């Protein structure tokens, strides 16, 4: 299938409680493989998946150095951001970063990403062209001007088209037994009377990977989008994910309802109904 590598970085200031904490977590698809936390007693790039453990000492200490420097960079960014928005030194603020690359089944670059949010709001993003920026406001325009002057986009493009794609391909090869294995959902439909007049049908999907899934209910073949309660896809803790969708149905009308499941691990999509 297609695959992604993404780093998710969070830097958060905490006036009166030391310097801003920096945490970076790296993923291939829905599998975390590294973490770095400046609050760790001994901050270092640490493995969080078995297939990365085979990388030698040079991998770990080179990445550790990048992340230690990134901690300082993000602190610089937070200081600058506070100024751009004329903010007090009393408050806590958050800078988030997402960067990395997507590749197709053949390992070719689909696109790169490098974007930032300040206090939960999009701030600046590298455009899909990997050459230009989109700034959200006049503060981000200051960053944009600075990054244009320093030709930052050219450095990011080189990273995203080269290093990122090269390492993603390497990770996919080393972890092929897991990263390139889609585990289909185990499914069932439960039935819960709520009154004499109505009952809940709940369609379950358990044990699937990756997280992307489509779970829908139909009544007489029509999608019940508005009337379906759909919980957020949630991690089980064993790499897999879970999800359910529920509809309230009139008593006696259960067989008019079908649950439909689409997932990469399924040979064919599923159509389930309540099986009393």
């Amino acid at each position: 299938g297609s695959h992604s590598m993404r780093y998710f970085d969070t830097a958060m200031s905490r006036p009166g409680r030391g310097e801003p904490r920096f945490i970076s977590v790296g993923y291939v698809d829905d599998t975390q493989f590294v973490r770095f936390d400046s609050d760790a007693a001994s901050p270092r790039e640490e493995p969080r998946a078995p297939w990365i453990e085979q990388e030698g000492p040079e991998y770990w200490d080179r990445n550790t150095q990048i992340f230690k420097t990134n901690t300082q960079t993000d602190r610089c960014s937070l200081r600058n951001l506070r100024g751009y928005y004329n903010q007090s030194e009393a408050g806590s603020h958050t800078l988030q970063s997402m960067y990395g690359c997507d590749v197709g089944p053949d390992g070719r670059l689909l696109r790169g990403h490098n974007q930032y949010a300040y206090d939960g709001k999009d701030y600046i993003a590298l455009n899909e062209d990997l050459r230009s920026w989109t700034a959200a406001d006049t503060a981000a325009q200051i960053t944009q001007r600075k990054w244009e002057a320093a030709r930052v986009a050219e450095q990011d493009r080189a990273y995203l088209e080269g290093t990122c794609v090269e390492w993603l391909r390497r990770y996919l090869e080393n972890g092929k037994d897991t990263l390139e294995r889609a585990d289909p959902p185990k499914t069932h439909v439960t039935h819960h009377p709520i009154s004499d007049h109505e009952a809940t049908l709940r369609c379950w999907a358990l044990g699937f990977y990756p997280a992307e899934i489509t779970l829908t209910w139909q009544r007489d073949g029509e999608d019940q989008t508005q009337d379906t309660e759909l919980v957020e896809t949630r991690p089980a803790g064993d790499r897999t994910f879970q999800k359910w969708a529920a509809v309230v149905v009139p008593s006696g009308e259960e067989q008019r309802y079908t649950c439909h499941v689409q997932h990469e691990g399924l040979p064919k999509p599923l159509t389930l109904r309540w099986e009393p």
Binding site: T73, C76, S77, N80, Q155, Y159, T163, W167
Partner: peptide, 9 residues
Amino acid sequence: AAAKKKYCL
């Protein structure tokens, strides 16, 4: 290295 060098905003 695998991780990306970041730039100050």
